[PDB]
């Protein structure tokens, strides 16, 4: 009953099971630990970062090793459009003979790989199960390096100080230039040297790379300035990927669009992209001042940025010390940027597939988009939660105020009511009218008169598609016109490739849109606005409100303030995160439902099914869920089973976890404490069991813990059931 | 010993033995005193 929460003496003195539960959930909140200083905080965070990167590299190495050992990578190379990639083998003693037979792939039961790693590794120039093994070996070596570094930087003479940790200019210069630019430069080097010849049949391994010229002229044009030579003779339109037939000699080109065979971006396009990004980031990494008297001091930049007329208060004067001294502000900024970035990855890796033969891998396309959108929602909610935490525990009004006037951040708490009221107005506006149009379509179609539907053509979005060259909406605007200056400017660089790809019905590049797209985009906007409303309200109201003008004194996460003053359930800022998680899950569900139904109709060919039935709710319920759930639920029946049996089991498992979350959310404490007391009496008053007694007094889960557990069940069930549905439906419908 | 015997050697090992020893260690640690 002691010594487990070593970091908290208050918990270690708890005589109940709450100590164990809270010991888990407070282990990473280093700022709240006993005998805590800032130096130890930054050092522990640094070591934890090292361990985390080691974990990531070990996970990647495991994926590589299991593809190399139990996969069919080599067979998939020779026939990427017919051979289904294998993730890893299965050894489960609970299998019957039927399950073994159904999951049997080649030599052993195995799982199909939906991560798209086969296409990614094939694109970057891997052709052998020994190339994957080398990658796994190297990644385990890198993990060992990172673990050694993490141990080393906790040693006495190697523990960095607060000044080093808060040295913003040095870290920015190095991160930008070194990390981004130099990693892009090295990736361009690999892309060219290995990937470009490997796509043309020439093997460039760790033996013949110092003697195989990536370009026939060989670094002469680069130093000579004749950089056009690297773009001459690109890959033809009859080039077979991985073979020298119809190949070229160029290494950096503009082509635009996709490879005619793999239906993916040109490797020479991506090498040029990464070279340009490398140059730009290396240049941008010299901005801030270091030991050589030139550069920028960001404190001065922030302080000097006050509009002269005066509408942002005193400007950004106090922001430097605010951000530097708070790890939650930086964490929130990083999480918001990462969420936007992974939303970008999801939205671009389906419209512009970058890996060979990934466009025809429909289950992996759906899985990748869903995975990245869910990660995006999680990251955004985390960014807002950490902003709220910064408000609660790191924000100092004195730093952000100069002689009564407030800086740009402190002024966000002055018109907080205006911000929240207008977020509420936008949410109500969008919800009222999107639901009104959807229900109008529902009722009108149900009454057998679909012509009375309200169908709004998304002209604004179709205008953008025409601006990028789509000649489908008869707009003749910028790139849909051959005479506009936008078209004449790039008529010789990348329009022929771009136009040939955007004006193609088999791509996902700028999918044609209609009224259903309009309505679902408005639903998405409503979801985004409502999630933002909840999170922003929790962040701004974190330090106090009218119901609790001292909420900052109770911390970020506390159960309530009691039944007084009318009742104060879910009044903390943590509860705002807890409520906004449901809205994030709902919004990501809407986004992924829209994407998956649109792409299922596109792949099956019945795009008229979406364009007609997507305007009313029953259309969704009947033609997406009810229609495509048939292959999934018949993964095992009283007659047999298929390789989709695991997905049906996961479907039911997700439903069960969802409803257990419903348990933990609807039923609150107090009802579970008295029942536990009855159980305690029963155990204490029964023979043959009195010999065994608990060391920690069994008590019901706390209010905040119960909310967390219900949210965890809700989210896990949500994710599992939707993953099972999307994967099984795609597999069982599209062969 | 072939490579295909490794799943049958490791999956029971990990998925049953590692839980047992991990539970023993974690229970002992969280039930300690001072």
């Amino acid at each position: 009953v002691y010594k487990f929460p070593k970091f908290s003496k208050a918990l270690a003195e708890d005589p109940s099971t709450r100590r164990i539960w809270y010991g888990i959930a407070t282990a990473h909140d280093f700022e709240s630990h006993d005998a805590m200083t800032e130096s130890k905080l930054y050092q522990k965070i640094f070591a934890s970062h090292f361990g985390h990167i080691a974990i990531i590299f070990l996970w990647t190495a495991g994926n590589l090793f299991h593809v190399a050992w139990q996969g069919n990578f080599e067979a998939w190379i020779l026939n990427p459009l017919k051979v289904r990639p294998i993730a890893h083998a299965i050894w489960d003693p609970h299998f019957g003979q039927a399950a073994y037979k159904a999951f049997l792939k080649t030599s052993s039961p195995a799982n199909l790989a939906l991560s798209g790693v086969y296409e990614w590794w094939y694109t970057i120039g891997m052709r052998t199960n020994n190339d994957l093994y080398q990658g796994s070996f190297f990644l385990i070596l890198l993990s060992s390096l990172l673990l050694f570094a993490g141990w080393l930087h906790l040693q006495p003479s190697f523990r960095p100080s607060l000044d080093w940790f808060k040295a913003n200019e040095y870290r920015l210069n190095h991160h930008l230039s070194g990390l981004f630019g130099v990693s892009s430069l090295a990736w361009t080097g690999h892309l060219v040297h290995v990937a470009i010849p490997e796509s043309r049949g020439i093997h460039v391994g760790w033996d013949n790379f110092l003697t195989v010229l990536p370009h026939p002229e060989g670094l002469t044009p680069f130093f000579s300035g004749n950089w056009k030579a690297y773009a001459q003779n690109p890959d033809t339109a009859s080039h077979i990927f991985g073979s020298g037939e119809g190949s070229g000699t160029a290494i950096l080109t503009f082509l635009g669009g996709f490879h005619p065979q793999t239906k993916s971006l040109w490797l020479t396009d991506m090498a040029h992209h990464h070279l340009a990004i490398a140059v730009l980031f290396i240049v941008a990494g010299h901005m801030y001042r270091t030991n050589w008297l030139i550069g920028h001091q960001m404190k001065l930049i922030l302080e000097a940025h006050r509009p002269p007329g005066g509408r942002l208060g005193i400007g950004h004067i106090g922001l430097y010390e605010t951000i530097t001294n708070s790890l939650h502000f930086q964490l929130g900024l990083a999480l918001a940027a990462l969420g936007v970035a992974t939303s970008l990855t999801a939205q671009h890796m389906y419209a512009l597939p970058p890996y060979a033969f990934l466009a025809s891998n429909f289950p992996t396309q759906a899985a990748l988009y869903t995975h990245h959108q869910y990660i995006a929602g999680f990251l955004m909610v985390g960014a807002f939660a950490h902003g709220a935490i910064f408000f609660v525990r790191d924000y100092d009004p004195a730093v952000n105020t100069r002689n009564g006037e407030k800086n740009v951040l402190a002024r966000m708490l002055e018109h907080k009511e205006a911000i929240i009221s207008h977020l509420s107005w936008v949410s109500l506006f969008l919800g009222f009218h999107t639901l009104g149009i959807y229900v109008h379509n529902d009722v009108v179609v149900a009454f057998g008169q679909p012509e009375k539907q309200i169908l709004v053509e998304p002209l604004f979005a179709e205008w953008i598609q025409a601006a990028s060259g789509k000649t489908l909406y008869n707009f003749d605007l910028l790139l849909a016109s051959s005479n506009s200056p936008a078209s004449v400017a790039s008529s010789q660089l990348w329009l022929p490739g771009w136009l040939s790809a955007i004006n193609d019905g088999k791509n996902s590049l700028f999918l044609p849109i209609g009224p259903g797209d309009f309505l679902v985009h408005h639903a998405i906007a409503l979801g985004l606005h409502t999630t933002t409303l909840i999170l922003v309200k929790g962040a701004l109201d974190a330090r106090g409100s009218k119901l609790m003008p001292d909420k900052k004194d109770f911390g970020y996460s506390f159960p309530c303030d009691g039944p007084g003053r009318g009742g104060t359930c879910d009044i903390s800022a943590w509860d705002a995160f807890y409520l906004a998680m449901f809205w994030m899950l709902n919004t990501i569900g809407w986004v992924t439902f829209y994407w998956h139904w649109k792409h299922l109709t596109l792949w099956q060919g019945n795009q008229v099914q979406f364009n007609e039935s997507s305007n009313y709710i029953m259309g969704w319920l009947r033609d997406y869920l009810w229609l495509n759930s048939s292959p999934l639920i018949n993964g095992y029946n009283p007659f047999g089973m298929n390789s989709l049996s695991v997905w049906a089991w996961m479907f039911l498992f997700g439903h069960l976890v969802w409803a257990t979350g419903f348990m933990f959310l609807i039923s609150w404490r107090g009802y579970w404490q008295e029942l536990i007391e009855t159980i305690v009496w029963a155990h204490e008053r029964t023979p043959l069991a009195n010999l065994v007694r608990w060391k920690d007094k069994p008590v019901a889960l706390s209010i905040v813990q119960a909310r967390l557990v219900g949210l965890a069940h809700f989210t896990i069930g949500y994710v599992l059931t939707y993953a099972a549905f999307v994967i099984a439906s795609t597999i069982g419908k599209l062969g | 010993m072939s490579l295909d015997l490794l799943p049958s050697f490791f999956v029971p090992l990990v998925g049953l033995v590692l839980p047992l020893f991990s539970i023993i260690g974690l229970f002992l640690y969280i039930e300690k005193e001072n």
Binding site: S48, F50, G51, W69, Y133, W151 | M1
Partner: peptide, 30 residues
């Protein structure tokens, strides 16, 4: 198909990475 030697040495290297992990884990304290 990878050999027994390839898998064996990868397992041995994985063990070394495990001993480095507990050293980091124990150094991050109880």
């Amino acid at each position: 198909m990878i050999y027994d030697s390839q898998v064996y040495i990868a397992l041995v290297i994985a063990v070394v990475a495990s001993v480095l992990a507990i050293r980091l884990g124990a150094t991050l304290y109880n």
